[model samples]
Target: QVCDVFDIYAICACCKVESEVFNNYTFRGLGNKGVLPWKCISLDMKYFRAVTTYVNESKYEKLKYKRCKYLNKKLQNVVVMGRTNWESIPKKFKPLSNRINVILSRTLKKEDFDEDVYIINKVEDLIVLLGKLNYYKCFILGGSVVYQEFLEKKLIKKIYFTRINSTYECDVFFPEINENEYQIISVSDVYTSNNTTLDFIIYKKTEEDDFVYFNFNKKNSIHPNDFQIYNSLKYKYHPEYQYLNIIYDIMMNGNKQSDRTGVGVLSKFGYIMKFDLSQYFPLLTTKKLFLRGIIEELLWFIRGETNGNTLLNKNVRIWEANGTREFLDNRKLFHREVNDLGPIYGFQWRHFGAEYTNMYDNYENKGVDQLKNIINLIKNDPTSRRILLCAWNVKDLDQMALPPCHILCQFYVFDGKLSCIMYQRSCDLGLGVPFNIASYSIFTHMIAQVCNLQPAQFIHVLGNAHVYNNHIDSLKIQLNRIPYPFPTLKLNPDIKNIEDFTISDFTIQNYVHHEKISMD
Candidate 1:
């Protein structure tokens, strides 16, 4: 009933038995003939595109070369798809043979198709095809091979998958894709006379980031906080069967959350840059990542401008508690005040007061340059306990809404590179992890920029890093899924200034993962 006003065309390379059924039953005249009730859209080379005089080179060459040549020259609106065939087809329909385009060979005769041909093999190729054909609504009706191929490539933007209650067995069966890639877009069920079951499920592909992976190898050493990433590396690449067992252990039998977070920071920083003096930057992956918003907030904090004006001007709405129009109308009255002229992260880094004769003498002269010098000295000299940067000023904690969630951070230079260690008081995995990762990485990049050093490592020390109540189910599902191995983060080569670095300048390589876990 739902099939009204639609035509379905199926293409396959079948044997003589299938062709006989198609010609006699499906295509033959009953109520419709030349101007049939429906169109015959099936293209089985057995009746349409195969040559009869087989077992010879001349037939192969003539069929292959001339078919593409003719199609390119004449067929404008027609879409030619490529497929293969076995020797099972009968000789009766061989005259309809045209060409065979090899999939994996990677070499198609260019002159044969001119500019009209499109060949697809891998997922990347399919992506290109999708991009190219964005203007056209193309249909792909096929046997299991083409269906599975398109599914694996993630090329089918939409699908209508049919299911029957009757048991049917075949040797070459199709495998399902990871659930994350698709969701049920629509469903239609067809029932035979007395409630025998037949159903069809239509699904649509979900859009996701084209992530690149990079491994932290000897080629690219660790950062100060590299330990954070390394601690979780063991659970990164696991088979689907092994996921629940390992995740359960991680949750119940493994180390404490804060300890693991700290170790992860150390591993990351050490591998990235061997800083003489560095601090922890926390990056979280378990939930939503707010990169630009958090970066704007950090920048605002660093500038010692404790208001929403700068961020609002930049159109960065991290601090906007509600919708845009509502926040904008009420934004003028709220100015986020910095500490009452005492020490916070910005104050400690920029204007730490000197103690003179039992009284605090305010000093607001230190800049990033001064910070870089101090870091260089710390890297060059190992035995220094003075390499700490504190964001917690006991006197100014009352003025703060959230008293430096990432309270205090420190760094050390070991071997040839600098490493940073951060100590955070709390971590909200759902709302906070993404910003943590980006902000920390950015901080490391900035430090590396000013100090004339490559990024070493980042070490994050957490007191409490818990999954938010709202994110527990999704987090559990994600925990059940396998994480990919840690990849290297590379900065753009041409960038010289610390302020010049941006999200575009960063690249990640070789990120591979297993199936997504079911949250529900």
Candidate 2:
């Protein structure tokens, strides 16, 4: 995608010796000069020397001295994971022993290794690393295999690609994840390259949907003439209209359901049926609610990372403690695998569930297929108990630091319209609620679109929707402020398939909100 988007000067592949033959043959056959870039950093002449005795004293001593110096410099803990071809010379690379963490070998054979430690064969290792190192922002640089591995794992959160004019071929190619899985959060084009400029793009994975209840502006914008007419009509209906306290109630409560409870009164009148776009916007509206912080946290999640270190680099303090960092540290020392940081949820959703069910497939038995099937099921049988999609696997819950938030969500279809019910185990009213509302509602709208059904209600069932002690005052103030008009969520009319709707295919109107809010 990058190569085609922006012309670049050159493209190269870094491959291991074992992979060199295959890469060379593959690329050369594609009609281009091919060279295998160094994939492993061996302890060569610069780092070591050959020895005559049982131990190469000069090389050993020099390596030891350098290793000690590097470790003693108070360098932040850095972990590098790769294939085990570089695992040898650990004693010689003693400096890296502490400051640099390493996970030996990469393989697909699960039974070959013990369950006590992390093995780098899969891309989940990158996310697991974040859980362990809560203070470092990891940079993944390596051969095509490593990159391909992460791409397939959905472990690469953001891609910094330099699209060159020249194209090169290799034995391994990066597998394509579904485009609908991510939205380009930001994009920048480099002007320096004469042949091909680099395009830096940041992507965000989609979660779920959110919707709205009322139009704030409509209620507040009644003209005096309209009010007079309403009053006159009420007076004609009854002589006691003048004695009615409706005006006082309106003044006391800025909105119809202002003080009794912040939640809309109609929200509690059973599962409200509405469309997805009816609430969440194509563009974000909860901008006043820690947009940047939420994005950064999301980026961390996309990296499939379970730590605070990567977030610390971006200065995104949203998940400070009682987050990924604290979760890893607080675990029992008995489990060494806990030390292996790996993919949690962000990767799983985009890459498809662990079962590798085709994410975009509309076939009858697949994940998304099942989703469509469930929608039809709802349409046929509205009161079935099995109208839900479950993302939580009880067997793997212990492996996860925390359970999934949008745990089990049900779908409903009525009057040729589709609706959804999301059951979230937790809700950070300040930082997460708005985004949750927006994302899920949009999702519902999209699904409704693909299913050829009118988008309906989004029922957000939160087990814990609490305002943190620190955010209570702000929440109260924001709640007190009159809400602006509700926005209309728009979708691309040309898109008819569930897999075809890209981020570009959506738009929003009438979104009125305050500045972005930051989480602690």
Candidate 3:
């Protein structure tokens, strides 16, 4: 009869009869009971509540209802309470209405309790029963013993704790939560309720495991705005919006500073943005992006060619700004020819300063090809952390018309997928940032294909992210407009080698965006 009532078929009949006998005797009596001998499974994804203070007594009656109201709004709610906690409530409110009330007791008879309340003899049984319920969420409203048992079992995911300011005389106390395991997500402003100062705090588990150590201080938590950009990019699939938010954050909070171009910028230090490559290609949909130059330039880089006219011959003029004879002469470059950008990204990437005569020179025999070596390392030792390609060679810095802005990129292999993190020393937020994001994303995808790994994540870390003062108004206008859906990048599956990819091999389809907003 007890097994039928509790719907627990796992235990033996003898134990069920003994549990029935114990429940009948205990319902009429009230005292502290010994801990029940029961094993519990870890239910790591359920919410729990504690409406108490430093001491166990409920000082703020009004705030307790706030938690009750919050749970009642859920689609299907279940509230778990200890026998003492169940008894503490008024007889009229014995079974919490509009929700399933689960009562935990070692010796509580199902027949003795109201039909609305379900009685369970063990914490393990309670957890097992709750898992079968079609409820959307579960809340554990507690007495001390129940709180201690659930916490000991490591079942709670989130804790909605109400801390009352005033002290109270009580026999029970809430269990101490490990700060290493949990972190406060939200805290309410102090409010006066029934002559007691109170605040409701919400804490979430930091990790699924038992112990985790992380510093949640100012150095790591720069601006909340900066963190939001990362969250929106990683957790949410909004690349264009992510870029827009970054620009807006800098415009609002950036420090005004002067630059080499004499065009001052609203600069901010240390900003990071991430993109999941599997979701969507991270081309800006807030404004039209010129993909022709982006594609041809990347192809030019991988080919180990430093001549800007190679891109110019393909009608890609992005490098034309720094490629002119006057531009090269002004910087006093060693190679000051018409299209000689002077061993910039291509030369440093493929042949790192081993002495190449010109763009047409055989780089394979002349210099150490870091790009090819890194690709080979990815295929042989995917787990190695030393897989990095650097384009910043200090020895040839003076010979180049313009130094590399996006300097080093490190590749990581996890779960048969490739991820990349790039470091940029300087960024022109309005003009250069969009191009840089798309460029690396394409590079990561290209490498992932050659290495037979799926493209996973692209992380862009900026040292000095800034917007030119002249471009601020145009950026503001770009921010005000709504962003369109990100475009899909279709790569020809037939082409396996990285060198075999050309502008025709790649296509950006379903691209929808506002008209182009140029900074220059």
Best by lDDT: 3
lDDT of each: 0.39, 0.41, 0.67
Candidate 1 residue lDDT tens string, 38-135: 22323212222222112344334453343345335211111223332211223453212333222311344434332323555453553334333311
Instruction: Name the weakest run of 10 consecutive residues (lDDT summed) in model 2.
Output: 3-12
Residue 5 lDDT in candidate 2:
14
Ranking by lDDT: 3, 2, 1
Candidate 3 stretches greater than 4 Å from native? 1-237
TM-score (all chains, Cα) for each model: 0.40, 0.37, 0.57
* Candidate 2 wrong stretches, greater than 4 Å: 1-385, 518-520
Query: Who wins the TM-score comparison?
Result: 3
How far in Å is the alpha carbon of 104 misplaced in model 3? 45
User: Model 1, which residues run further than 4 Å from truth?
Assistant: 1-290, 320-344, 354-373, 376-383, 485-488, 492-520
Over 349-454, each residue of candidate 2 has an lDDT whose tens digit, in order, gives 3322443212122323322334444556655676677776654656545555455777766777777677788877755555565677666666677667766787
List, in order, the clash count of every candidate structure. Answer: 75, 27, 1
